[PDB]
Write a protein that binds this ligand. Structure first.
Ligand SMILES: C[C@@H]1CCN(S(=O)(=O)N2Cc3ccc(Cl)cc3[C@H](C(=O)Nc3cncc4ccccc34)C2)C1
Ligand SMILES: C[C@@H]1CCN(S(=O)(=O)N2Cc3ccc(Cl)cc3[C@H](C(=O)Nc3cncc4ccccc34)C2)C1
Ligand SMILES: [Cl-]
Lengths: 302, 299
């Protein structure tokens, strides 16, 4: 029993965190085999950030301009290349602690663990989600750039996020491990702002199924709804549209609890209308959207 | 910016998790140097001295990854079984066994069959239970804090109570709370809110740019405690006020000034507003957790 926002054990990722320094800038790198991956803005000054020409700034650098530190050991840089918004530093030592891994690009609504680091040293681990507006509501300070997001289903670490920047509203933007940004963001200090955020509907529904599994049914009603009527209502509360794919994905939880997806949708419709009236659901007074259908099955069942 | 329920990096603890089997019961063990620590109920009104005397070393099957550790001795300390093994754990970190007080927080590495599955942050409730997330097979999972490079082990999971909350011991086998390790009628006492922790989280909200709850008012410590007793909040002591000093100086809001804001939130609610994305007053961040997360302390 119990339901917690649970992160993956961070050990496999801790053994990859290094510090990368170029001139006055110091940030985090991910050391996998003989390559260190880090945000390409490590080659920029604060001035450069307005309109940086990364190809021009990079061509002026040599291998010895990049200082890479793994614990108390300096790694030697023997090559460098840029792939989108990530700098790849070839080093002379393969990481002996390299876990089994994959680089995966996630979609909005997907969750992952973040190992927040400063000066190549891990300070904490937390669970979060890729928001529909492609930002993440993280907890990051100056120097956290290069911290990574991941999942560890089985013994394979799937790296899905690398931290690059903090937006004006305090939310965060970054790339997959191939350097492609999530969202319409650029690694440039420009007037860019997060789009209006919405609630991840399929995730709230999954969390309502988690409450049922844990013994809570107070929010259920005798009603059902069509998918289209549900979407017309949910859109008015800034909820993401629920697609047929979402309904399919919720099938296992629907079968385990005996509550049809569209009957759970009717309960969500009523919660949006009435609020909770002094009650909580799994210890929360708000509708939680940072647990996917997959996370619910993983935690409530094993 | 941002404020998350953050756990310590679990790596130093992952390298210590093993699977312990005795007969039909399988649970988790903590392998430090040449000893494996685990709940004594793995041998299971039980007379533990009588159940233990009937066991030999080879009755305990200890597995570290894909390797079997041979048990060469066994002894009991309170509600923890200590299994002497032939091999010292080469991944043993620098560590201490510490007993925590209610209100203190820690990270839990939840394991099943000696394999870590997740990490989460939680607090020792004033009623000595923890609101964790555990299933059958989670027994022996541990709670810890990291200070510098030293892992301070403070909790070992033993059981779930009827309300879905959890009970366990420190690493010396002494239970937190009036609980015993057996199938008997047990229940968590009436819980209270950790006041010093809510105040710390209110200081964290001010640091992150949320000030709607601040007011021009102050209060005496005694008047605040009279209001706190009415709302099932733990009494705030002068020690709590001292501990909140750094956060008070960083934000320019006196502790009793922040107490007056808390008094108003308890008496009137949040009125459709949230604080750090929460419609409830959060009490599982200590003053030290707030300073550490708003400063970036690394391990
Ligand atoms: C919120 C401030 C406002 C201006 N900057 S900054 O620190 O000068 N800045 C600009 C900038 C622009 C583009 C890119 Cl790709 C990176 C960056 C850097 C950045 O975003 N780094 C940070 C990443 N995460 C949390 C941060 C928290 C507090 C500071 C900085 C953080 C540096 C951010
Ligand atoms: C809540 C159930 C009700 C009955 N039992 S049990 O599973 O039969 N049971 C008896 C028992 C008695 C004394 C001690 Cl010290 C430990 C235990 C065990 C226990 O508490 N283990 C669990 C620990 N955490 C989460 C668990 C989740 C689901 C099952 C079990 C869990 C097993 C607990
Ligand atoms: Cl995805």
């Amino acid at each position: 029993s119990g339901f917690r926002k649970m992160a993956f054990p961070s050990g496999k990722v801790e053994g990859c965190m290094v510090q990368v320094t170029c001139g006055t800038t110091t940030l985090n790198g991910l050391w996998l085999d003989d390559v260190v991956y880090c945000p390409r803005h490590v080659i920029c000054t604060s001035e450069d950030m307005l309109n940086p020409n990364y190809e021009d700034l990079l061509i002026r650098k040599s291998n010895h301009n990049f200082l890479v530190q793994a614990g108390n050991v300096q790694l030697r840089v023997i090559g460098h290349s840029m792939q989108n918004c990530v700098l790849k530093l070839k080093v002379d030592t393969a990481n002996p602690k390299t876990p089994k891994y994959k680089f995966v690009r996630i979609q909005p609504g997907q969750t992952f663990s973040v190992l927040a680091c400063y000066n190549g040293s891990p300070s904490g681990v937390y669970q979060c989600a890729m928001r529909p507006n492609f930002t993440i509501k993280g907890s990051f300070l100056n120097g956290s750039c290069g911290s990574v997001g991941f999942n560890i289903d089985y013994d394979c670490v799937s790296f899905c996020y690398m931290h690059h920047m903090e937006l004006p509203t305090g939310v965060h933007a970054g790339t997959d491990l191939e350097g492609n940004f999530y969202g319409p963001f650029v690694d440039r200090q420009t007037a860019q702002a997060a789009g209006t955020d919405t609630t991840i509907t399929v995730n709230v529904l999954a969390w309502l199924y988690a409450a049922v599994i844990n013994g809570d049914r107070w929010f259920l009603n005798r009603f059902t709804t069509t998918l289209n009527d549900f979407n017309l209502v949910a859109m008015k509360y800034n909820y993401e549209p629920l697609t047929q794919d979402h309904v399919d994905i919720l099938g296992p939880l629907s079968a385990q609890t005996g509550i049809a997806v569209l009957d759970m949708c009717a309960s969500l419709k009523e919660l949006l209308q009435n609020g909770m009236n002094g009650r909580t659901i799994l210890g929360s007074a708000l509708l939680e959207d940072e647990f996917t259908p997959f996370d619910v099955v993983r935690q409530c069942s094993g």
